[PDB]
Swiss-Prot record, chain A:
It comes from the Archaea. Residues 27-51 are annotated as: Disordered. Keywords: Ribonucleoprotein, Ribosomal protein, RNA-binding, rRNA-binding. Part of the 50S ribosomal subunit. Residues 44-51 have a biased composition (Basic and acidic residues). One of the primary rRNA binding proteins, this protein initially binds near the 5'-end of the 23S rRNA. It is important during the early stages of 50S assembly. It makes multiple contacts with different domains of the 23S rRNA in the assembled 50S subunit and ribosome. Residues 31-43 have a biased composition (Basic residues). This is Large ribosomal subunit protein uL4. The keyword DNA-binding does not apply. GO terms for molecular function: RNA binding; rRNA binding; structural constituent of ribosome. One of its GO terms (cellular component) is cytosolic large ribosomal subunit. One of its GO terms (biological process) is translation.
UniProtKB/Swiss-Prot annotation, chain C:
HAMAP family: Ribosomal_uL13. PANTHER family: LARGE RIBOSOMAL SUBUNIT PROTEIN UL13, RIBOSOMAL PROTEIN L13. SUPFAM superfamilies: Ribosomal protein L13. It comes from Methanosarcina acetivorans (strain ATCC 35395 / DSM 2834 / JCM 12185 / C2A). Signal peptide: none annotated. It comes from the Archaea. The gene is rpl13. GO terms for molecular function: mRNA binding; structural constituent of ribosome. This is Large ribosomal subunit protein uL13.
Length: 51, 132, 138
RNA sequence: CCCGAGAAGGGAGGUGCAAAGUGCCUGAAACCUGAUAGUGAUGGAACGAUACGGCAUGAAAGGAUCUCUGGCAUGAAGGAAUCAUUCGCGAGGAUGUAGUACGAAUGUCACUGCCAGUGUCGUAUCUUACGUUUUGAAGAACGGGCCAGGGAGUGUAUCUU
RNA sequence: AGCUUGUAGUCCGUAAGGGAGACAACCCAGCCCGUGGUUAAGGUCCCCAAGUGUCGACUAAGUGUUAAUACUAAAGGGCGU
RNA sequence: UGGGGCCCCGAAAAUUGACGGGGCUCAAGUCGACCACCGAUACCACGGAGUACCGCAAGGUAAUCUCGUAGGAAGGCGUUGUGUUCGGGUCGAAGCAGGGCUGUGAAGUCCUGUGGACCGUUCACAAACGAAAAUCCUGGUAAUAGUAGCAGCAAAGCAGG
RNA sequence: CCCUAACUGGAGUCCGGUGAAGCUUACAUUCUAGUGCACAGUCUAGAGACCUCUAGGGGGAAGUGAAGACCCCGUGGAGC
């Protein structure tokens, strides 16, 4: 769950900000691959079979 | 110093390339002068309404193979020689001074560069970069 | 030094504008009040009072009243006067009501193709009549 | 050691291969201060492209029959002027001169010390940004103050090729 | 109706460049790069390259100086010419 | 009396404005004709690039090849690492600022300065591999601007030391 | 209110100190008309315009604030 162990949710429209998920007690964006500290979109998987 | 070996057809193509590349546009990405975040390298214009993608003459030339230099003199140094990048002393044996000039690698140290220059000078090989 | 007496305003203006754009001379135009505008007097007066009273006061056109200034303005419209070439041309043009004292006795010329005796009728007014009906003292 | 109210700071002077001078390796951009070049208080706006000029620069990495200026030879397409004759109401046309002189360029011989490039400004022509949504975007449609960095077709299984 | 819905051709969409003041789709033209030449559409009084061109008439209203055109007023009348 | 051309009346709109503008009257308008010229990337010529097809190759052919959105197809550039080949570096690596040259270009290389220890290269193979945009994210930092506020509900200070 | 005037204190105005924020792709001294997705500072043709600064009220920037809450659409919800 690297980058994904947050409870961040979006603010929605009406605040002049992007709709990205944010921390419940701050405006800091979380969990999305283009957020700092967010998850890697399409990372290497230990379950990948390279043989 | 050995005379450049270039037959008259190659001379004619060399002068043709000189004239034609004197007129070649710089091929900067569209609007690179308008944003400091943008580099000057070429990017293909992609927007549907972009004036340079639509090929308005005023917006500057698009990159296309019609601007290629003549194939006989393509890649030659402006002195007429062929640029050969020498990364060590052992590479100077594969070069003949009639039509090739060596360019010594930029990270070669002064101690080795002096030896490379001595060997090139004994071989008669032209050097594009040295200390003068 | 061009004598504007008995000359068509637009044709004299076109000739002088082309000469100024040929860029080798200073042109003086004298007797600008005596230039001719073909057409009926009512129509010319109507169009000139429409042009005179048009614009906005803070912005709009300020159409001149003096016949020399009107003639310079007429030439002004046949030049690229917002450009350096046109600005240079307008700086080399001087138009006068009557003859200025300095140019008195100088040798003048007349444009043969702008002559008003080439007109086929008597429907014309002089530029001075237009200027004085617009309230210009000259 | 000097200035400074100074347990600040600055100057001078040292240490060190190097200030690297303590959140101190390298030390970009935005942004800000100053300098230099060009321009500039009569001036018109997608900030550029192209051509030609002014000013500045042009050490290296670019040219040296290269740059400048001319001669001579060959020259594709094209192709006069002038004059003679003739036709036309006329603007003009045709025939000859003449496919001549010239002509992209290609060679060659002299002359020359610049040229390429770069910055800025000027003149000329052209262009109402970019991405998007759109039948239609310069739009009074949506997006971005700016810069830096991050930011989106991946793995397992299975089928097909 | 610059409306709505068909059809044939051709365009814009996705079409530069040249010309119409500007013009998605109107005219020339489909366009690799450079140079020279000659044309196309369109234009030749100035802005603006090239005609103040020629012949024969008309218009007196600045009418007009507006290919197509969503960008251009009718019926009716005139011993105006 | 009939049939025709052009014009006139019919004909009133809101900021000052539109033959593109100036202006134009045996025209610079209209009609019928004509003459010469200007004017594209069209067409012609020369030179060059690429492409398609053919050819063992050398090369040959192209009036019948060269616009392009969605989109398909082909070949390349770059980033980091692995195997492997061959190297460079304190006589100065990477990075950074600016510049020269090559390449259609992705980019590469070199020069100057700065920097102080690492960096490439052959043939292959991989991927957490390329940003200008997402009211994108994080950080830094402008214009606004020496501006608003430092008043309103309890207007409080002055002299001398 | 006719129809406003004078005056008082606090702001403002000017000076010293302190010191933010919000609109912003760019450029930008405009005005008229046309054109253009039929509501242009930037296009077209004209008309204007020497630059900088201060004060001032808000004409315009279809000013800024808010992914319209009206209408429709979604084989989207919720409550009743
Ligand atoms: Mg990045
Ligand atoms: Mg059509
Ligand atoms: Mg579409
Ligand atoms: Mg098409
Ligand atoms: Mg076009
Ligand atoms: Mg495509
Ligand atoms: Mg970025
Ligand atoms: Mg449905």
């Amino acid at each position: 769950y690297s980058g994904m162990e947050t409870s961040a949710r979006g603010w929605g429209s009406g605040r002049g900000v992007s709709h990205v998920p944010r921390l419940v007690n701050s405006s800091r964006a979380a969990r999305v691959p283009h957020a700092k500290g967010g998850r890697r979109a399409h990372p290497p998987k230990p379950e990948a079979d390279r043989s | 110093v050995s005379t450049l070996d270039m037959d008259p057809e190659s001379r004619r193509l060399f002068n043709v390339r000189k004239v034609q590349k004197g007129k070649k546009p710089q091929f900067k990405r569209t609007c690179s002068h308008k944003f400091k975040r943008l580099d000057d390298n070429w990017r293909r214009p992609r927007g549907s309404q972009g004036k340079q993608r639509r090929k308005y003459v005023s917006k500057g030339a698009l990159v296309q193979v019609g601007y290629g230099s003549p194939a006989a003199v393509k890649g030659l140094h402006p002195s007429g020689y062929s640029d050969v990048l020498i990364s060590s002393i052992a590479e100077l044996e594969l070069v003949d001074p009639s039509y090739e000039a060596i360019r010594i690698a930029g990270t070669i140290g002064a101690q080795k560069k002096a030896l490379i220059l001595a060997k090139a000078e004994e071989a008669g090989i032209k050097v594009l970069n040295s200390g003068r | 030094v061009i004598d504007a007496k008995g000359l068509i305003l637009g044709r004299l203006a076109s000739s002088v504008a082309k000469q100024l754009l040929s860029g080798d001379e200073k042109v003086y135009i004298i007797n600008a009040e005596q230039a001719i505008i073909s057409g009926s007097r009512a129509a010319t007066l109507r169009e000139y009072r429409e042009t005179r009273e048009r614009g906005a006061t803070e912005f709009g056109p300020y159409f001149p009243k003096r016949p020399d200034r009107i003639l310079k303005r007429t030439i002004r419209g046949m030049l690229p006067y917002k450009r350096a070439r046109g600005r240079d041309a307008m700086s080399r043009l001087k138009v006068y009501v009557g003859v200025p004292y300095e140019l008195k006795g100088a040798e003048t010329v007349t444009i043969p193709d702008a002559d008003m005796r080439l007109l086929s009728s008597s429907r014309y007014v002089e530029l001075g009549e237009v200027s004085q009906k617009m309230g210009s003292k000259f």
